[PDB]
């Protein structure tokens, strides 16, 4: 019930498509709370559309934690993960 070593990864390295969901939404609300963005931001705004622009650059410094049903945890960073 603890962290799995990065050496062994049993998972699909692709996105969850709920990856895109919570990664985006979370990053957004972060933007709404005024957190520093990691990308050049064009003349537009709002959290969501610029968050999309971030994941285009894959600059989100977050890790999806994943629960195997046995409670064996899991870790994947965005930069680790592939679209």
């Amino acid at each position: 019930e603890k962290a799995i070593p990065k050496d062994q990864r049993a998972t699909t390295p692709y996105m969850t498509k709920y990856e895109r969901a919570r990664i985006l939404g979370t990053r957004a609300l972060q933007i709404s709370m005024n957190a520093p963005v990691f990308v050049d931001l064009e003349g537009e705004t709002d959290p969501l559309r610029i968050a999309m622009k971030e994941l285009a650059e894959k600059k989100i410094p977050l890790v999806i934690r994943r629960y195997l049903p046995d409670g064996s945890f899991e870790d994947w960073s965005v930069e680790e993960l592939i679209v």
Binding site: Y18, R22, P61, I64, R66
Partner: protein, 97 residues
């Protein structure tokens, strides 16, 4: 899913599925509520129909996984510090004992 063709219609829906909330959310609400409370079912908070009642975050789907950010900092600065308040005055009581 358990031993036999069952379920669907309420009368088979008591099979495994243990959540008294939704068992009332379908049919025969009352006697499931009471008869539940009598037998003092320990229950659990699990399903969709479950977790929307109590309104906390859904188990599956978007919520099928927690989200984490890394602190990204080295344990080098996690080392303790002192001038050893304890160590220098240690050796007083160490004698005659």
């Amino acid at each position: 899913y358990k031993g036999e063709v069952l379920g669907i219609t309420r009368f088979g829906l008591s099979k495994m599925r243990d959540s008294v909330l939704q068992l009332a959310s379908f049919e025969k609400t009352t006697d499931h509520l009471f008869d539940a409370a009598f037998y003092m079912k320990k229950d659990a908070v699990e399903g969709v129909s479950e977790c929307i009642i109590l309104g906390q975050t859904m188990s599956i789907g978007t919520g099928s996984f927690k989200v984490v950010k890394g602190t990204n900092i080295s344990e080098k600065d996690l080392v303790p510090k002192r001038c050893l308040f304890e160590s220098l005055s240690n050796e007083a009581a160490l004698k005659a004992n």
